[PDB]
Amino acid sequence: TKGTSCRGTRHNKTHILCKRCGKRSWHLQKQRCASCGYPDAKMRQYAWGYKALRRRTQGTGRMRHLKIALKR
Amino acid sequence: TGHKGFSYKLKLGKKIHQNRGVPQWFRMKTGNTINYNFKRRHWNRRKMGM
Amino acid sequence: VFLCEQKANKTMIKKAVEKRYGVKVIKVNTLVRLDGLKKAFVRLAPDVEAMEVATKIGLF
Amino acid sequence: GRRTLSQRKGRGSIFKSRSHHKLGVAQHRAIDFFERHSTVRGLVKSIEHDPGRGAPLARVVFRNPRQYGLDKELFICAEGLYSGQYIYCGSKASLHIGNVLPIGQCPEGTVVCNVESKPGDRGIIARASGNYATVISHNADNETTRIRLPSGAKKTLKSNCRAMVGIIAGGGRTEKPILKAGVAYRMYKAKRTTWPRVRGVAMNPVDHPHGGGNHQHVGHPTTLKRSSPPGQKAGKVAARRTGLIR
Amino acid sequence: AVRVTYVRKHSYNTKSNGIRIVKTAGGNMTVQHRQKISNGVRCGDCGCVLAGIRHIRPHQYGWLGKSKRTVTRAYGGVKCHKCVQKKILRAFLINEHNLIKLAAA
RNA sequence: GAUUCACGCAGUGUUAACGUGCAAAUUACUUGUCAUAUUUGAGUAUAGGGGCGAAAGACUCAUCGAACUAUCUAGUAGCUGG
RNA sequence: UGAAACUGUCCUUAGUGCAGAUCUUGGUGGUAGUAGCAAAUACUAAGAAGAGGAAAAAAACAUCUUAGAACUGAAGAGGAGAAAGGUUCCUAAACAACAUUACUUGGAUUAGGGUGAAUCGAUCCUAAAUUACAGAUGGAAAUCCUUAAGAAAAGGAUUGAAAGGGAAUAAGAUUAAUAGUUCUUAAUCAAGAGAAUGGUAACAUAUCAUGAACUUUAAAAUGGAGUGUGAAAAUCUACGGAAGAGUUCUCUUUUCUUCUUAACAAAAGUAAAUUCCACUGAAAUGAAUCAAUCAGAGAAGUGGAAUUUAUUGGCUUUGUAAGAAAUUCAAUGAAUUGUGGUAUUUUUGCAGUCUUCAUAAAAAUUAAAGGGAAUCUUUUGCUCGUACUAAUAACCGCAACAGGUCUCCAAGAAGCAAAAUCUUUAGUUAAAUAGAAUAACGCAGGUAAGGGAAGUCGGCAACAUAGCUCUGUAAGUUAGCAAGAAAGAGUAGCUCUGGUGAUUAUCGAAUCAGAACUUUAAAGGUUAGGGGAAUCCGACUGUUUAAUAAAAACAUAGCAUUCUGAUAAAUCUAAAAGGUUCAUUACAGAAUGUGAUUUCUGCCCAGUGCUCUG
RNA sequence: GGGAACGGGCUUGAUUGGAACGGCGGGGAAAGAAGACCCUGUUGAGCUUGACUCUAAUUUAUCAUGUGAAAUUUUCACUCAUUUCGUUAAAUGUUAAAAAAACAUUAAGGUUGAAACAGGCGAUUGAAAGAGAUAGACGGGGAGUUUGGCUGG
RNA sequence: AAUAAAAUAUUACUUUGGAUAGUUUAGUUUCCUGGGCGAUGAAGAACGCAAUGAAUUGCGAUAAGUGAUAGGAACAAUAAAAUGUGAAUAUCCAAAAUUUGAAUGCUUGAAAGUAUACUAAGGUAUAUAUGAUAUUCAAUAUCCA
Secondary structure (H helix, E strand, O other), X not given: OOOOHHHHHOOOXXXXXXXXXXXXXXXXXXXXXOOOOOOOOOOOOOOOOHHHHHHOOOXXXXXXXXXXXXXX | OOOOOHHHHHHHXXXXXXXXXXXXXXXXXXXXXXXXXXXXXXXXOOOOOO | OEEEOOOOOHHHHHHHHXXXXXXXXXXXXXXXXXXXXXXXXXXEOOOOOHHHHHHHHOOO | OOOOHHHHHOOOOOOOOOOOXXXXXXXXXXXXXXXXXXXXXXXXEEEEOOOOOOOOEEEEEEEOOOOOOEEEOEEEOEOOOOOOOEEEEEOOOOOOOOOEEEOOOOOOOOEEEOEOOOOOOOOOEOOOOOOOEEEEXXXXXXXXXXXXXXXXXXXXXXXXXXXXXXXXXXXXXXXXXXXXXXXXXXXXXXXXXXOOOOOHHHOOOOOOOOOOOOOOXXXXXXXXXXXXXXXXXXXXXXXXXXXXXX | OOOOOOOOOXXXXXXXXXXXXXXXXXXXXXXXXXXXXXXXOEOOOOOOEXXXXXXXXXXXXXXXXXXXXXXOOOOOOOOOHHHHHHHHHHHHHHHHHHHHHOOOO
């Protein structure tokens, strides 16, 4: 019963959306985000996660105020 | 659920709003390749993970 | 039945409806739709006829 | 190998004390002037059952000697105390059952319980059900007295340590034979998670040092030095004797 | 036999989710939310339930008449009439004894 | 922590069905059990030479005599294939 | 064929020549019109719409209405919620794809519509637990501490429950869909604005009838079992009718349906149980329960007080309120809406009894007391959730998967029974396609002459006993059991008789026993123990390898051994005014072996351990 | 028959009409899976142990300067770092002067009423213990690794 | 012995598939110049804004855009309006800049919220550490009348 039957009771969320990164990686019982490293001030980045760095970093968003400054 | 937070309901409403197709007039523009929205999903076809 | 900004409460909606249309409001019921708009149900005083206000607004 | 269950007990994750319905901390009132140069009178309002311990606890109510109000204590019941009784604590208290006196004002051969090992520490020794300590001798030279601990050991204490006269209630608790595994299950309702104890020999070599082979046996002596590292310290530690006694 | 449904969104038979099925017009049965059972006051000494005070919820004594939550007697509403008689005798008899014991015995 | 039946549960036997299945462990009858060492929801605690185990090396997201994931890493191969 | 670039020679350069690597990526065959589209009892007739039942029976035809026949059988295939899903809800147009045939159907395509709260919840409080400033620790990241270390917080900070606690809303109607939320009517709550009498006493008086600091008490707020009983609802039933429907060639003064009432308040009439008060003082001891249990620190008796009994005050009754609603009749308008029960079940309280080496939460918040400091009308009630499924099609399993997933309401028959079986209200007739033929071999359910385990590793599988009543019951035994031992007899239908009560002859309860007569000689439609004599293991109830082992394995109580005076023992951590047993204290904590009870545990200290006061 | 010693193909013969339907289980050394038994590899992993080499924890000695004595270097006496505790840091020190389950508070200019002062909040331990460094012992609790070859397997 | 249904063989044409050929608003590498963010709130995330938009793009309650400076007649899928009295377009400029985020009055889960002061609503300020100055204090800590 480790296969099909045991999947029926899965109706309790472990992660929900995080306030800082918008992903569903906020652990409800650990009170921290698995992806962006919430309340920790620094963003969670690792050298072994090089793809994770090229997915969310500088230049992946709007750059509302930095696009004018560097252009200036 | 029946009970939901305020912000969570608005992110549910936006998912409803984005499940629409290309309007006909947009398809008649010159040099147009966008015919169907490939970001479409249905409640019984794919769960949106939120 | 109006559509208002979600950041407005029944107290400000009641004042705004009176100010904009010069009527009397005795009850406001609001619900926030899925899209994001706050639908308001405004009931006017018995001596104010709502049907004539609709024609002035443009619904008729 | 793995970590034995003895090692896992020191972490305190599922082995924490089940102290939710406990009444409080059973101890004497804090030492002050009126307990050192006079007497305070306490009223035994009620006798109650504290989960996880065999002796009943008494709710004693002293008046506040310095301010206006009450001062609610929680003593361990001496065998004989009743509701509505008056008990007196202090250096001048009479030698009646239930009264708290400094250990130096008690005659030789007297019986005390809830003794203080160090003055003002509100009770350490002789606290279990039916247990008591007996005063052996005094020494006015250095103001120290000797008492006999319930294990037969003799201990020397400062003569101003407080103690309650009498015997802790609930004697004979362990003389009734448990009969069912269910009854032993209910004993640890307000205690730690230790009851169903699997024999080490029934385990596997990874889990325990006793985890045996094709026959359930230990294979090496079960008497170990005190300096054994945790994990291999299983059996009898620093044992000077074994076998049955004649 | 008419079968009913929970009106509120509670779905479990907890103490606060007690219901009573009453009958209404046309043979329809509706659902009433019934209150919990409270306890009355107790004497501070003997722990016996006092007489003359109703067994209602603590906030409901605010709606009670000012004379319907206490008994017109010294230590009324906190002590039984027997709890008070012994108080008077203790106060008087002990003071009398302390007048012959000390004060020119 | 008596004997049983029932709502449920389990999984003794048929070593029945099925075995490119209803199903990556299910079905039918039979059997056992069916409230105090009971059954169960939500919350909460315990994390990889760690935890948890009425102890089977069992369980730890279909993964366990050491999980999953990424990096060192195009690890090394006197061996096999081209 | 194709329609804009390309070729020869010499040198130079190389990501330069493929049949293989279970090679990589893509495309495609035989298999093959083959295996299949067979769990969930079941559909038929007439009509409508539609291109879509034609025809030499092409034997089948999706959707909707009516009729017939059926199934889930009220612990449901019913009516509603929590998690999860997220627009799947409703309507209209439309069917290319999808739901193993088809579809006019759809949880599918397109486009609009839909979720209304002072009273329901979140918001508020704290529980297990969780996280901050300063401090402590660490090379570091960071860890510790949660009131202890602080010039911090009258006293201890943050979070933590849509099942724990909590101020206050009900009935009817209404929408294609929301409704304790809208409408009508009727209420409630919070925040406001405009130094008293009576009673012997228990105690009592539409606000009344002052009551600060400070302190205390109580409530919120507390297990389970089993027995008795009050009350309501449901079912059943008695009397009395009103209205409508069914049967009626054979009868039936007959069978069936309706005869209702909210929140909040009032107080004609009137209950059960418990606890107190006054008079008096019990023995010739009384009183009382199903059981108990109680009495000179005072019984029974009489007279009182109080509280509980789903809102005021439990039931009837009353305002609400008949104007509503239900059942009929007429073409909007008219008719009625008594009284009971020594029956059963459920719910809800109450009363004492039993049980624990188990004693079965806290805060927000409220009231009262001790004390004596001081001298009716009207306004407002903010933010957020609210649609729908909640499952043999909306959830998790790749899916419209026979698997899994927490709850509430709950009719008749029959029976000990919430059992099997059949029906009522509600729901549905479709839920991976049919038609013809009726071969072998299969899957599921059966029967059998004579014999009766001769089959086989093995009575595997099947057969067989089976309810109730009476009689009767062995060895063995821890004296409790074995025991439903084993064994034997009875049981139907019809017509009668007697026993078991209440009020002063009438009224009611299903239960037991007995007697004639008849027959197909009677538990058996369904449900429903095979029995006996021994041996081995485990004492027992219990747990176990999710997915080949449920056991003789683990656990268990019992027995025993070892260490420890708490600044300790065990033991987590890199460290730490750090952490666990420990809210603890030898009848305790920690570490082990054996495995109930009875009986007995023999000899050996040389070796290896451990220890020593040497 | 021979062949890698059990051919559908080769050699010699027996014999053959093309397409197939329902069954069936002899063969296709049928399918599923880089044999899981055995061996080899200077390939591993779990577990054990006085296998080799180490290590956490435990333990022992020396160093790390509190005063004041006394002996022949432990042996003591104090507190002053230090250890362990307790409270609302709530009368410390020295002078002066068991009859009763009830109540107990906001006192009749500014000092008495309610005594003054100590340079110690109250105890406990104590120059020893603990942590550090170096050195010996113990240490499968744990880490790494190894466990020759030939051989009628 | 016999037939060519099936089977086989070649070519042409069609079909399934997308190789080959032609092609490039895309990449790779080297070199040159810089290496110009943030409490005056960054990077990132969310939500919202077009006459008809779902994504994407641009932008922020002044919204696929405003003012100013250059610029000179367009846009287009379909309508409208405005337009040489200045349409598209560009910019190191000006105004404006929702919720968050180091996120900083307090709380934050998917949480709706909320206290004080200043200037009913609206807007500012209030985290921790920290330098300088001013000011109010605490300690018989050192003296001292």
